[PDB]
Design a binder for this molecule. Sequence first.
Ligand SMILES: O=C(NO)C1=CCCC1
Ligand SMILES: [K+]
Ligand SMILES: [K+]
Ligand SMILES: [Zn+2]
Length: 357
Amino acid sequence: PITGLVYDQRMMLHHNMWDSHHPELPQRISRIFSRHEELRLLSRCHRIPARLATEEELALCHSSKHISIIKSSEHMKPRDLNRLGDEYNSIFISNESYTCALLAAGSCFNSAQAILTGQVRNAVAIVRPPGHHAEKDTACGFCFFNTAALTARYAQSITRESLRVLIVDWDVHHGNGTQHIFEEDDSVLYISLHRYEDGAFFPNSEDANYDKVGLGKGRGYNVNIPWNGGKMGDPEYMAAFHHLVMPIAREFAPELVLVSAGFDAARGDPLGGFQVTPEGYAHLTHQLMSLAAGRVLIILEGGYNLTSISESMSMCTSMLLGDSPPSLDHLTPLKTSATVSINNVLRAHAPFWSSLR
Ligand SMILES: O=C(NO)C1=CCCC1
Ligand SMILES: [K+]
Ligand SMILES: [K+]
Ligand SMILES: [Zn+2]
């Protein structure tokens, strides 16, 4: 009944040298860690060490060209770093960025290994830079390497190739990189909830719509839950879990659950515009703990209100430790567009998942 936790202050070294107030701040992870200490959650966890991902491990999901370019940034001058970052969509780079991305991935590898060998029951990874926008061949949206995708492949490499991994991505943005990496794969089920606005929300692609169900062998194994026209919160997320996430996940019967746990859908976030509460994230975590014999790894993605993300992720760790869920506020009726979204996903995925029929 042990919960693992990985945090390493070295991941704060990745920084924006032209805009020191950029929202993807070094103190995102130190604030989450501090709140775990304040709530006396840290002493209840087993500390898991960070490590660098190797280049061979990065190649589980990424091209050699992309790996080499980010690797080369470690020795670049600021003028090189500025121009290189501006080649990507929403990326800043410093001489420490590559090392920090390696530590984010390697920290999650060690956590998955601890879960899969039974050292811990579940775990939380307080890591940055985030990962779920990173593609096979390019960086994007503050992400260099796709930490969650890499962890799924790493998990398969130390168990068996066809280990069933569920990735639930509740960051407010679509994890375009994770979807693309696994789009043709039936061993990794990707489920994303995200603000969509008919494509008028980052990353601004109709790839995030509900009709993208996967390709080839992966048909049915990509579940997009897109939100339109509404300040979504606990009622909508609870409804999506009840009607979609949990029935599909139970039928898939994962052997490992990875959460791309961005907290930018949280009330107070400067970018997301949603109002999921810390108790809401607690309830989402508690439901996922009923899968995979409790083998859940919570990986920090986005989330930019330091107070909101600290309370929200700490509440997730409280759930992993076995604490009872806090009480939700009175769940208001769903925003009408959320009902439309959920019904659209149900129709798209009922062909592949008999639990939705
Ligand atoms: O939080 C994020 N992704 O999860 C952001 C990347 C670019 C703008 C917002
Ligand atoms: K998401
Ligand atoms: K998939
Ligand atoms: Zn995000």
